[PDB]
């Protein structure tokens, strides 16, 4: 017979502590509990020494009068091109913060070229993509970029040096560049049959590499060690081998809606940002299931980005908080990737219930560029 | 002591003899679900 | 029987207590098959690369019983 | 040093070079104004075509080099007339240091290289005589050391490289835990003060680094005061010129507030004996402290 | 012109079949993403349970809670209805931009939930909040 768990003693209530007609009722309640109430008998990640961490924002770029949809940094690391719903493309000097290129020429996204000698930017406006080479660079760079190219149709102003406009049936949402700079991946969620298009600049042609697509495509990117194309659909993440035109792997995110994806430089790890306030770490050699799930954000998570060199990655959500994680990856089979929280950057505004829309990492050092809905760019150092 | 409890004096409160790095430590909740036992930290 | 396409999955299942034994099968096409006898399924990983083969074999836990062809 | 006066400019004062009389202030608007001791601009450089980066006068009231975002440094001889433009850098020249004794002047660029431009010896539109390379990241700034043949170069790679212009190679590259943005060489103390991105000024001995914190943001420029060799002023991104002391490593000796402020960020700092400490930045106003 | 912003209708196709919705805004012309006469609607996914003179305020409030939904629906899948439901809180909050922006979709869903709370508590559109038995 387990004990009836004797009631707690007096709680220091008395004639005058600085902290009875009902007595029969409590006693009756105690007697009731004696036969009616059931009786039941009852590591260290050490972030200090591994501090590739940054800290609070130091440089604030202002001049956007609307939400900044997407921003990117050139390979040289000194040019930061940003764009938003205003249609104004602004190129910023990272060290000084000047807005040297004020020419505007909605901007869904814009991406730099991988080739340093060919600074060409693919900028998406509605269903049209412009290949812009600003005259801020030396002249020989413009000629060097021209010979790169000089379904979707190709067509050949305050310094509007436009090269090849690409018109697509649907409004492109995501842009990605191949490592060699010859392939451009453009994705639109609205369409289906032709949701994603691959553009070969050297051949000057566009095609749909997919005969039949399942699920709406949210984003796309290129593998960093191989030509594989990572297609982030609404619920799945599918790996496609393009040279043999087939499907390699399918990642079961366990997510109602996938927002964005980022790829480790080693190519064996994928991080999935979700509208379900979840960051999904996938180890391609571990499982099609997520290796880790993280649900720290209070609102829908918008963007996830891995630093190309340093073992840090970040997640930007609509709550205005940017979550910075340290992810260490070893080539060993025993060594599972080490994911640890490092910082939670705050003090970012939310407009129309929209927060951190896009986050980008400096190619060299631990500098994070965050775009808000108020038109502000934060450079967390 | 009588002076404390003389007739009409003050009464001390009657006591019942029955009555008897931090940021990272608090925020380390990796994917654990049921293993998350912050219920104890929220009550105790 | 189950086929595993992920090496770290093979290690994780090997780490699991239900693992009983392991077989290494060397085929004539220089492709190795790492087979793991569990309570319910024979988990097989087809490794076509030689260098990944023996690093996996030394990656296997020492307590597990690994057996030649 | 009490503040003397402030002179307005069209844009942010990217580069400041203070001499006994001449005071060159190159701004982001593409104009470099040679302000006098009182503040009268003797002449303004025109036709640059790009945002000026840094100014460095080889001699007072004489030829003064001014780098621009177009990877070209124009040498205006003093009104200032552009005698020749030294170009050839892959990226924009981040900063340029002038040498009076030697025609070769070092110039750190964003292309991770330091080019030694020459007044006449340059390969003329004039390729640098010695385009030294080796820095992993962009070369943020270059300052000549005590010896005219050597110059310290700080960059984003967190490695301060003592490049010898005679040899064209970095003799020693001191690595630090934070990326350095500005380098100033104090010959009297035989030290090189580096404005690391961690808001700390590291005084490294060329022959080892003493760190001094206190700046609210990243340090943008450094210059040792001629009056006191132990004292060195440092204009940071917090629009403040923190003048620290080598002996007093526990913070800056005196933090001078900029005369004009706007989230302003001071960018250029110079320390002339006659003109005092000249500071400038995003406030578009060159202030002087005597 | 029987389908206007503020008209009650019924959904006959999809997961939310047999549910009563209010036309938030009509795109009778069509759209590139939806090449048909679609209209965005807000409906009641889980109808509130019936209440009685008895039961405490806790139970009455627990049974009075309403779960909404927002959905773009084809005209051919909507069944128009004579009753009309209008409130200024639900005018113009929804658009295509809201559907693309998932946080705005959730925010609009919560706003529709709250608006249905005051409406149900105030006792308006009792028919709209009564489930249809088919």
Q: Name the experimental technique.
A: cryo-EM
**CA-to-CA dists, residue A293 to A43, A271, A280, D48, angstroms:** 18, 10, 5, 54
SS3 label, residue A378: strand
DSSP state of D71: S
A165 and chain B in contact, CB less than 8 A: no
Q: Which residue of A has its CA nearest to E105?
A: A353
Domain that holds residue C27: 1-69
Q: Please name the residue of chain D whose CA is at the shortest distance from the CA of residue A93.
A: D69
Edge-to-edge strands, sheet with D276-281: D3-8, D285-289, D276-281, D266-272
Helix axes E57-64, E102-122, angle to 10 degrees: 130
User: Alpha-carbon distance E85 to A3, whole Å?
Assistant: 60
Considering only CB atoms, C55 lies closest to which of A286, A333, A336, namely A333
Give D181's contacts in chain A (Cβ within 8 Å).
95
Q: What are the phi and psi torsion angles at E64 (to 5°)?
A: -90, -10
Chain pair A-B, CB pairs under 8 angstroms: 39
Chain mean position to CA E62: 20
| Dist CA A279 CA A314 (whole Å) | 10
CA of C44: how far to CAs of C32, C33, D139, D277, E13, in Å? 10, 7, 54, 74, 46
DSSP tag of A354: B
Is the CB of residue A218 less than 8 Å from the CB of residue A234? yes
Q: How many CB atoms lie within 10 A of CB D225?
A: 21
Q: Do E104 and A354 touch (CB under 8 A)?
A: yes
Rounded Cα distance between A182 and D280, Å, is 44
Contacts of range B7-12, beta carbons closer than 8 Å, 24 or more positions apart: B11/A15, B11/A16
Residue whose C-alpha is closest to residue A173's, from A114, A103, A108, A113: A108
Measure the CA angle with vertex E23, ends E127 and E34; round to 5°.
140
Query: Which residues precede chain breaks (C–N over 2.5 Å) in chain B?
Result: 20
d(C-alpha A124, C-alpha A128), whole Å: 6
Q: Which of A312, A216, A103 is nearest to A121 (CA)?
A: A103
| Rounded CA Rg of chain A | 27
**Which of A275, A353, A355 is the closest to E107 by Cβ?**
A353
Find tokens 């002591």 and name the residue.
B1
- What is the arrangement of strands in the sheet containing A368-371, beginning at the earlier edge strand? A57-61, A377-380, A368-371, A358-361
* Long-range CB contacts for residues A9-14, cutoff 8 Å, separation at least 24: A9/B16, A9/B18, A9/B19, A10/B16, A10/B18, A10/B19, A11/B16, A11/B19, A12/B15, A12/B16, A12/B19, A13/B16, A14/B13, A14/B14, A14/B15, A14/B16
**Which chain A residues are within 8 Å of D179, Cβ to Cβ?**
365
Distance CA D240, CA D237 (A): 7
Residue E1 lies in a domain: no
Q: To which H or E segment does residue A371 belong?
A: strand A368-371
Q: Rounded to whole angstroms, how far apart are CA atoms A128 and A139?
A: 26
Is A365 in Cβ contact with D138 (below 8 Å)?
Answer: no
The answer to whether the CB of C14 falls within 8 A of the CB of C23 is no
Which residue, A250, A258, A285, A293, is CA-closest to A269?
A: A285
Tokens of A290: 């997520």
E129 membership: H or E segment, kind and range: helix E126-129
The set of residues, in sequence order, having a beta carbon less than 8 Å from that of B18 and lying 6+ positions away, is: A9, A10
The CA distance from A81 to A24, in Å, is: 78
CA distance A292 to A282: 7
Taking CA atoms, E127 is separated from E18, E75, E118, in Å, by 14, 22, 15
Cα atoms in the 13 Å half-sphere on the side-chain side of D79: 7
CB of D279 closer than 8 Å to CB of D255: no
Contact residues, chain A, for E101 at CB < 8 Å: 354
CB atoms A299 and E32 under 8 Å: no
Distance from CA of D217 to the nearest CA of A (A): 6
Q: Is the CB of A257 inside 8 Å of chain C's CB atoms?
A: no
DSSP annotation of B24: H
The tokens describing A316, both together, are 């930007």
Contacts of A292 in chain B (CB under 8 A): 30-31
**Closest-CA residue to A351 (of E104, E97, E112):** E104
Q: Edge to edge, what strands does the sheet with D72-77 contain? A: D52-57, D64-68, D72-77, D81-87
Resolution in A: 2.8
Identify the DSSP state of E88: G
Q: Which residues are CB-contacts of B17 (< 8 A; sequence separation ≥ 6)?
A: none
Chain C residues within 8 A of A332 when measuring between CB atoms: 59
Q: Which residue of A has its CA nearest to E98?
A: A352
DSSP state string for A54-121: --SEEEEE---SS---EEEE-TTSSEEEEE-TT---EEEETTT----B-----EEEEEE-S-TT---E
E101: contact with A, CB 8 A cutoff: yes
Q: How far apart are CA A306 and CA A262, in angstroms?
A: 6
Nearest to D263 among A60, A364, A365 (CB): A60
H or E element that contains E98: helix E96-100
For residues E37 and E29, give the distance between their C-alpha atoms in angstroms, rounded to a whole number: 6
CA distance A89 to A114: 19
Please name the residue of chain A whose CA is at the shortest distance from the CA of residue B23. Answer: A343
For residue D113, the SS3 value is: strand
* Contact (CB<8Å) C8/A288: no
Q: Which of residues 315-344 of A touch C (CB under 8 A)?
A: 332-334, 336
**Tokens for D109?**
């660029």
Pinpoint the alpha helices (H) of C1-69: 7-15, 50-59
d(CA A166, CA D168): 47
Among E33, E101, E104, the residue with its CB nearest the CB of A190 is: E33
Interface contact E107, partner A, CB < 8 A: yes
**Distance, CA of E23 to CA of E79 (rounded, Å):** 11
Structure tokens at C54: 């023996």
H or E segment and range at residue E102 = helix E102-122
**What's A164's DSSP letter?**
-
Hey, is A31 helix, strand or coil? helix
Give the count of alpha carbons within 13 A of B16, CB side only: 15
Quote the number of domains for chain E: 1
Residues of E in contact with A190 (CB under 8 A): 32-33
Are D33 and D25 in contact by the 8 Å Cβ rule? The answer is yes
**How many domains does the structure of chain C reveal?**
1
Taking residue A329's Cβ as centre, other Cβ atoms within 10 Å add up to 18
| A·C CB contacts under 8 A | 24
Residues 356-375 of A with CB under 8 A from D: 364-365
Interface mutation target, options D49, D92, D125, D236, chain A, most CBs of A under 10 Å: D92
Cβ of D91 and A76 within 8 Å?
yes
- D128-134 CB contacts, 8 Å cutoff, 24+ apart: D128/D86, D128/D88, D128/D89, D129/D104, D130/D104, D130/D165, D130/D168, D131/D88, D131/D89, D132/D163, D132/D165, D132/D168, D132/D169, D132/D170, D134/D161, D134/D163, D134/D169, D134/D170, D134/D173
* Contact flag A249-C11 (C-beta cutoff 8 Å): no
Token reading at A136: 């801020």
């Amino acid at each position: 017979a387990p004990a009836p768990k004797l009631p707690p003693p007096s709680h220091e209530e008395s004639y005058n502590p600085p902290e009875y007609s009902n007595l029969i009722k409590e006693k009756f309640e105690r007697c009731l509990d004696l036969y009616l109430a059931p009786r039941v008998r009852r590591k260290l990640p050490t972030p200090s020494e591994l501090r590739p961490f940054p800290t609070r924002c130091t440089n604030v770029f202002i001049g956007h009068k609307g939400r900044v949809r997407c921003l990117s940094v050139h390979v040289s690391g000194n040019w930061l091109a940003s764009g938003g719903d205003d249609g104004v493309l602004r190129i910023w000097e990272v060290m000084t913060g000047r807005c040297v290129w004020k020419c505007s020429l909605i901007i869904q996204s814009l991406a730099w070229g991988p080739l340093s000698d060919s600074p060409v930017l693919a900028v998406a406006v509605d269903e049209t993509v412009y290949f812009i080479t600003p005259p801020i660079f030396s002249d020989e760079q413009i000629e060097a970029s021209k010979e790169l190219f000089t379904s979707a149709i190709w067509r050949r102003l305050h310094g509007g040096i436009v090269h090849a406009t690409v018109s697509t049936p649907s409004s492109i949402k995501s842009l990605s560049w191949h490592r060699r700079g010859d392939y451009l991946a453009t994705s639109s969620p609205t369409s289906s049959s032709q949701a994603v298009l691959i553009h070969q600049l050297s051949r000057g042609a566009s095609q749909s590499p997919f005969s039949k697509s399942k699920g709406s495509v949210q984003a796309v990117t290129f593998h960093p060690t191989m030509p594989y194309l990572l297609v982030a659909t609404q619920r799945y993440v599918r790996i496609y081998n393009l040279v043999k035109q087939e499907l390699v792997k399918t990642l079961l995110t366990g997510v109602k809606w996938v927002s964005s994806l980022s790829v480790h430089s080693s190519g064996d790890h994928v991080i999935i940002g979700s509208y379900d306030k979840r960051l999904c770490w996938f180890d391609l050699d571990f499982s099609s299931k997520p290796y880790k799930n993280l649900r720290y954000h209070s609102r829908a998570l918008r963007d996830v980005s891995y630093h190309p060199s340093l073992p840090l990655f970040c997640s930007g959500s609509d709550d205005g908080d940017v979550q910075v994680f340290h992810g260490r990856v070893y080539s060993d089979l025993l060594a599972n990737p080490l994911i640890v929280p490092l910082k939670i950057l705050r003090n970012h505004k939310v407009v129309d219930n929209v927060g951190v829309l896009s986050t980008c990492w400096h190619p060299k050092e631990a500098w994070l560029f965050s775009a808000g809905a108020g038109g502000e760019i934060r450079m967390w150092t | 002591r009588t002076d404390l409890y003389a007739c009409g004096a003050t009464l001390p409160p009657h006591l019942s003899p029955f009555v008897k790095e931090e940021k990272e430590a608090k925020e380390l909740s990796k994917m654990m679900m049921s293993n998350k036992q912050r219920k104890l930290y929220s009550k105790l | 029987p189950r086929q595993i396409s992920d090496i770290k999955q093979f290690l994780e299942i090997a780490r699991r207590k239900d693992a009983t034994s392991a077989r290494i099968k060397k085929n004539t096409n220089k492709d190795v098959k790492f087979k793991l006898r569990c309570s319910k399924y024979l988990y097989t990983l087809v490794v076509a690369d030689a260098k990944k083969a023996e690093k996996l074999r030394q990656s296997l836990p020492p307590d597990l019983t690994v057996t030649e062809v | 040093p009490a503040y003397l006066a402030s002179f307005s400019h069209d844009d942010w004062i990217s580069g400041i070079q203070l001499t006994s009389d001449t005071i060159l202030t190159s701004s982001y608007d593409g104009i470099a104004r040679v302000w006098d001791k009182s503040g009268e601009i003797k002449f303004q450089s025109t036709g640059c075509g790009s945002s000026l980066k840094s100014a460095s006068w080889h001699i007072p009231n004489q030829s003064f080099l001014t780098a621009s975002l177009d990877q070209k440094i124009f040498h205006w001889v003093i009104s200032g007339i552009l005698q020749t433009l030294f170009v050839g850098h892959k990226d924009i020249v981040e900063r340029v240091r002038s040498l009076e004794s030697s025609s070769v002047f070092i110039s750190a660029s964003a292309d991770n290289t330091v080019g030694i431009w020459d007044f006449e010896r340059s390969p003329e539109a004039r390729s640098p005589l010695i385009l030294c390379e080796g820095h992993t990241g962009p070369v943020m700034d270059i300052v000549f050391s005590d010896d005219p043949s050597v110059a310290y170069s700080v960059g984003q790679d967190h490695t301060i490289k003592t490049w010898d212009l005679i040899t064209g190679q970095n003799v020693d590259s001191k690595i630090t835990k934070a990326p350095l943005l500005c380098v100033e060489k104090l010959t009297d103390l035989h030290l090189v003060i580096c404005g690391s991105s961690a808001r700390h000024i590291v005084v490294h001995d060329p022959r080892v680094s003493h760190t001094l914190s206190g700046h609210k943001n990243l340090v943008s420029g450094l210059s040792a005061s001629p009056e006191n060799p132990y004292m060195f002023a440092s204009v940071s991104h917090d629009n403040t010129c923190r003048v620290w002391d080598v002996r007093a490593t526990s913070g800056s000796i005196y933090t001078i507030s900029r005369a004009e402020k706007t989230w302003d960020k001071l960018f250029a700092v110079d320390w002339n004996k006659s003109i005092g400490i000249v500071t400038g930045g995003t406030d578009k106003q060159l202030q002087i402290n005597q | 012109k029987i389908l206007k912003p503020g008209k009650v209708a019924l959904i006959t196709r999809g997961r939310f079949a047999g549910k009563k919705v209010v036309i938030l805004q009509a795109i009778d012309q069509g759209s590139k993403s939806h090449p048909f006469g679609h209209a965005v609607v807000a409906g009641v996914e889980r109808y509130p349970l019936k209440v009685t003179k008895s039961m405490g305020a806790k139970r009455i409030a627990r049974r009075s809670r309403v779960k909404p939904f927002i959905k773009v629906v084809n005209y051919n899948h909507l069944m128009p209805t004579r009753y009309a439901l209008e409130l200024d809180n639900l005018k113009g909050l929804i658009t295509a931009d809201t559907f693309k922006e998932p946080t705005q979709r959730s925010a609009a869903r919560k706003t529709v939930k709250k608006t249905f709370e005051e409406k149900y508590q105030s006792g308006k559109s009792a028919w709209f909040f009564t489930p249809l038995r088919f």
